[PDB]
Amino acid sequence: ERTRERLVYEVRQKCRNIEDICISCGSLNVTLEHPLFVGGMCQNCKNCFLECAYQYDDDGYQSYCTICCGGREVLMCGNNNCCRCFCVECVDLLVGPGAAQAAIKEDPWNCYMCGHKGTYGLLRRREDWPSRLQMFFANNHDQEFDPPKVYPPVPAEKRKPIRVLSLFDGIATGLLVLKDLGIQVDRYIASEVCEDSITVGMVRHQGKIMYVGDVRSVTQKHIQEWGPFDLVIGGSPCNDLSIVNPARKGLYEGTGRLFFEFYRLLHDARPKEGDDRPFFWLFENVVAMGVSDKRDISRFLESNPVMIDAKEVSAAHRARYFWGNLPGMNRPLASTVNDKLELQECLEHGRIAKFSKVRTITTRSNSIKQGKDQHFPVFMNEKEDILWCTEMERVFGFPVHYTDVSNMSRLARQRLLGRSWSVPVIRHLFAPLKEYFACV
Amino acid sequence: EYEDGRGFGIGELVWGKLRGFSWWPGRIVSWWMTGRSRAAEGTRWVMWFGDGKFSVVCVEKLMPLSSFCSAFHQATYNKQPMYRKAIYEVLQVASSRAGKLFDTAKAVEVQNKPMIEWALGGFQPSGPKGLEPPEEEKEIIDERTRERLVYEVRQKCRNIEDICISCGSLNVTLEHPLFVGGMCQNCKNCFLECAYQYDDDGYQSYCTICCGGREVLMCGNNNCCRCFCVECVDLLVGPGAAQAAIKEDPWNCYMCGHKGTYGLLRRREDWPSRLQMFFANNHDQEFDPPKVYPPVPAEKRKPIRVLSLFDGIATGLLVLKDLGIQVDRYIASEVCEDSITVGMVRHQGKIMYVGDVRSVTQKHIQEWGPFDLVIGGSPCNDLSIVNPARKGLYEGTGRLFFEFYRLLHDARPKEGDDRPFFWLFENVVAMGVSDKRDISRFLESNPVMIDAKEVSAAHRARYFWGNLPGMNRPLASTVNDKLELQECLEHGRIAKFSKVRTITTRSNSIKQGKDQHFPVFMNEKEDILWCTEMERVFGFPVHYTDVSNMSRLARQRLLGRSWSVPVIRHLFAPLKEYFACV
Amino acid sequence: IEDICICCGSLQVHTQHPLFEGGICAPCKDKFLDALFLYDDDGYQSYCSICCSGETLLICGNPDCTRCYCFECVDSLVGPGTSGKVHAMSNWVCYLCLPSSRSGLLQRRRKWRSQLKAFYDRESENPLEMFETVPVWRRQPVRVLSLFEDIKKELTSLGFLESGSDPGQLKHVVDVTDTVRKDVEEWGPFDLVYGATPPLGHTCDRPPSWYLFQFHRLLQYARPKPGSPRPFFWMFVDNLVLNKEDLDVASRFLEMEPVTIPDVHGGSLQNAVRVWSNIPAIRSRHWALVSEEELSLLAQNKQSSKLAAKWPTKLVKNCFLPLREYFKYF
Amino acid sequence: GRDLIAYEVKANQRNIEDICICCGSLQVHTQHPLFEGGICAPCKDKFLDALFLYDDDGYQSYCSICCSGETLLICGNPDCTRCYCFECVDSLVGPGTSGKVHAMSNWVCYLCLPSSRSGLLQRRRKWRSQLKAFYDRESENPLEMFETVPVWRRQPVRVLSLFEDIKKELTSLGFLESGSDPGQLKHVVDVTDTVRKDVEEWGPFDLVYGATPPLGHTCDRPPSWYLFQFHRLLQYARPKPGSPRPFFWMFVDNLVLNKEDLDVASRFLEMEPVTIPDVHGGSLQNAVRVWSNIPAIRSRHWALVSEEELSLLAQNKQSSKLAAKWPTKLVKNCFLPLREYFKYFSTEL
Ligand SMILES: Nc1ncnc2c1ncn2[C@@H]1O[C@H](CSCC[C@H](N)C(=O)O)[C@@H](O)[C@H]1O
Ligand SMILES: Nc1ncnc2c1ncn2[C@@H]1O[C@H](CSCC[C@H](N)C(=O)O)[C@@H](O)[C@H]1O
Ligand SMILES: [Zn+2]
Ligand SMILES: [Zn+2]
Ligand SMILES: [Zn+2]
Ligand SMILES: [Zn+2]
Ligand SMILES: [Zn+2]
Ligand SMILES: [Zn+2]
Ligand SMILES: [Zn+2]
């Protein structure tokens, strides 16, 4: 029922405008424009694109092509520190037939976004693609919720200490960022089940964190007696929510259920009708989830998500969705001097980082020949060296040797940091709080 | 001599069944190796090849070892591990005599299976006849010598200080440091060998009195790992004391006790000073005091040049930098990948590693010279007497010590050109007295036993040689160092030990191992020492050895072989005065 | 009067009688409490309103009154011979409906609902969210937001809705996944939120927790304005199709024990439901003899069976009976 | 032009420096050390090959000028053992004089008798240090070699012994007087007790000979001890810096050291072990490994010797019940170059 070849053949004949036909699936129901290349792109194409634009294989390259967004073949880009990939149909149908094998012949093949040349036949790269992509992930959605209420700033003479429900804090990034930012806390109770996570939270933070064990055991009565609360943050697990897993357990069986538990506690934390306190709530999740789960989350939390990418402020391609009503969550990222941005700057002594802005930290047991080089981003004294844990806890903005507790093995703290919030992102999101809140 | 018609000639090795003993393996020798006078009929001078002292057994309690498994005991094998190490050594020497060939605790339990199986077989390849000596080993002392001298001590016939409390010999030369009484020269050598011999379990291997570990009693109270043999408590204290001590659960060892006398056996009130004088001032060869150099003027203090053999984690450079001493060059030799990468990464790359010490020659030392501070420490794995597989100083890793000696001469200036030079060598204290004598004779200097318990939070007491100024001065406790384990714990944890000597988890060891390997209560429950815990205890900077992957086992086995930071600071303090500082 | 119990005549009293003037004894409390709003299958109060005994009942002739009395209660309190006159009366106007308060030794307390609420709150060691009863001349028609199935017929058969009425009171949406706060507020106020899972044997591609989670969300958008006397009630009934983990999740999200309502015919159990509700006197309907094994095997036989999924309209009949005392009956 | 050198010097009248004297080659690279003249590259190569080489009879293997062992001439005075060639004498001394020298019995070599001129022959003044210079600047690996002393300046040799007796070997070479006091040779059966002070207070020693006991009933001490102790004692006995007196040592092993210990010895003594084989009738009876400082130690080194055959020999000796006998012949010959260094005693008379 679909013939992309016929559409492209009649388009090259100067008969149909490229902007009037979708490229991802070839549908004629064009609503918006593709954020990467010139040409139209349908709504189902948008749904498939939100599921695949930032879905990266554990190997370290895009699992599926950025245009077709899903296929039983895919071509890795030969250029390092550029994960984006294309499918053979897109190469031989948009750029021109007989171009895929020519690209394979060129060992240092540069992807159509990385290459300097912007013209590739029918396929041409938009000059302002980063801004259009940011608008694609933040400035248009399927929800029309009214903007959340804004709380006017309070005088410094009456700025009380902050009460935080830090659900799913894991490595306990929230209170570390709070302390570094300069804001003090009255009580800070968190829910966590991992023994290593609670050990790190108790040790590195001088016992300021008060744990409640598994989050399924706390009810609304506990929140009522333990409040009133001001800030409620959540980092719900993404093992069964991200589209990276083949199983696709979804939001409605597995660890995804935990999400709604968060929501329940949130409805037990926000003021009923008093509106006498500047209540703030933040939720973090991955960028590569299904559209169904996306809209379910957005409609349950009653807030439009905002995309924050750790690329613009740190050295990791950790792009995440934040729901909430912190002031200026959609504010552009600020590159502070204090926090590192480049891998080479935050590299150890006597080493050279052959990559830049690494996003691959899993060793994958040396993977394979294709896995080699990518999983292996450090070249020390003419020999490859796998990433050291100090290095990746440096790139995430954490303090040096932040997680040297409980004598964990390399893999234990590997997986512990593989699901942790990026420190500079949390710093950016919590920066407006110090204006409204007391500073120690 | 030594003909009685009952066999058991010189060189034969069998068990013994002495009073209160259950078939301890040993051998037969003559008198001029044990240091005692002529024997008599039925007086078989027994040379226990294991860890026991030197005594006598009679043929009635002697049975041939040809029937190995017929009279073998399993309880001592599986619940009393120095029996296993004695079995190791005796089986090895028996196989060497017969010509047949086939972490420490793990190694011994792995290796003992083939030889114990061959013993189960019935010694088939060589036969019972194959246990022959190798054609070379082929007053009066009675059986109850100790039971007789003590029988006169409480009668006041003979002075207690006139008789040795370790072997009952009348040739008392020095006074026993720890306890009141005499002490023979063989007892001196045994004590110097096995007084600080702490097992990885965290308990003294042998007895405190006679330094012979046969059936010792655990000191119930914590921070006291000293042991007492059953014979010593039965004789010096009195009969039935061992049963009473073992009956109560938290029994306190006598020199750990609250009262200074326990019958014929009483503690010396000045025991620490006498012990320190012993371990540093009874070594049996006297050398001239080390040459001291005049203090150079403050305006002509050149930067220090340091050659650190067996550097490990570069503790020497760390202590030098912490002392504020400029290092012009720090050439260090190391083979371990983790050690060399930690030394290269934690510091700023000033360490010009050479690599293997066995390959560096005099040309390299001359080219990189002159060197005016040579530090190092030989591998103590095969040099400590605590190792059941002790091979010797002349074979294995111990041989590397002599390599150090070579390079030391390669840096020592000639008789002329009087310029400052300082060298330091570190080694384990629990090692053979002959090895210590030879090591101190090669270096042409006498050692000093520096105990990390004075300044650090651990008990890493080591022999330090060298001519650095002020080894003999007592250790100084600084304000900014941690003495007890509690100051080294992370927040929210309670220290079970005032001080610690255990860093090895030993795979949970045993029930007795519990309450000894887990010196911290974190969530009102036992926990294992963390990776940063040994760093803080040993005086190392926080998160010092968090380089590369270095799982818990590797970081533990690397920090356990390193020097004590405050001890090295104490020993290097004069170098600040005698070298450039900034 | 105050020192003598009126329920059983005991001389040991603890507090004033809840309904009318007089005394009451501790067993009299507990017996009233076990049937505080229990209703039988006939649609009326199962026991007496005073002595709480079902042996003798006096059905009120007022179409807007349901609470009954006992022959012994009227003979001993009101006076001998009144029981026969009450029974023989074609249109008997009980005692609380008519404004008269003096009738023999029986005294009616003005505004009984206030002290009934006070005693219910002061007694309930295991309380439940509930609102004050609305008087007869102040009640309002019910507003219901139905979920996932046709629900109007049960309410019309229960008198809460009338045939041919406008759909402005009942909204049925099977695809509430697209609901918005604006949509909820433009539907208008709602007093009862009713939802359920489809009967066993019905195809369901989506996970069952769907019908739970959005329900909760709608419930949270249907909560009344704080401090209002607005009688807002909700409940959720499941046809044994959710797993035990899902049952725990639902019980925690509703903060209610899963009170089951089994249906046993001829000594055999053929169907059962689990109810999460805040309606008063629903814990008394709990069945403790039911265990997991037989309900689970019955459920598995239900999926294995070919019979069409029939929704149990009869089992939910007893849930809405007390709401007659709260809202209009047509 | 071996015989044309006389024609070249007498007729062409050219300096003999520019022409080789050893063979007559016109091309030269440096001056001849022993006598004033020239030398070619192969001539100097074979000169360094047999500079201090000795035969079993105790004399020079090759000639001191032309390096030929075919027409060697003995010296009447025993303390000089220089050997010459008929061709060299007939070419530079003069034709026909070789037979005259050979016929009449006693003879004083040109290096011995103080005459600086004899025909074309000429002796360099202070040539003795010139030999040191030649060895220093004309060798690819000039390890270490000391300036020899004249016959009248030769003190009796003072020799230390470790674990083995060398006095029989020295008396067989006439280095020491038979029945003399032990002052010039002290033997140390057990050495673990000695200290630098006591080593000094025997007196200065010009030789430290330490030998591992032969294969067989080896003492309980490990064989590596037998070399580490020798190294330490040699270090004690080193002459005081500033006066470099002739100092030599020779550590010899009878094949009771494993390969790793051979490597350790190579690092410690900075000397590759020179294997000394002994073959009778084509059968390798015994062999020793020598780390020596005396000159001309690598000349006798044998390339055909292999490690596997030596290990087989060691295993055969261990299996056999032969008595512990030292290889006297193997080490006896090697001390011959010390004749030039230390005073000679004639014990035959
Ligand atoms: N049932 C449960 N109850 C509570 N915490 C849970 C949980 N299941 C998983 N978690 C924890 O929730 C976290 C989700 S990953 C997010 C971690 C956090 N954002 C950080 O900065 O580290 C993990 O710590 C995981 O162990
Ligand atoms: N052949 C060899 N050459 C050089 N170093 C060696 C070696 N064999 C072992 N070593 C190293 O020598 C060290 C012995 S322990 C030395 C202690 C050291 N000063 C410290 O503070 O760590 C170890 O680091 C070991 O790895
Ligand atoms: Zn499309
Ligand atoms: Zn594609
Ligand atoms: Zn690219
Ligand atoms: Zn003694
Ligand atoms: Zn003892
Ligand atoms: Zn004690
Ligand atoms: Zn009553």
Ligand SMILES: [Zn+2]
């Ligand atoms: Zn009525």
Ligand SMILES: [Zn+2]
């Ligand atoms: Zn009644």
Ligand SMILES: [Zn+2]
């Ligand atoms: Zn020539």
Ligand SMILES: [Zn+2]
């Ligand atoms: Zn010649």
Ligand SMILES: [Zn+2]
């Ligand atoms: Zn001569």
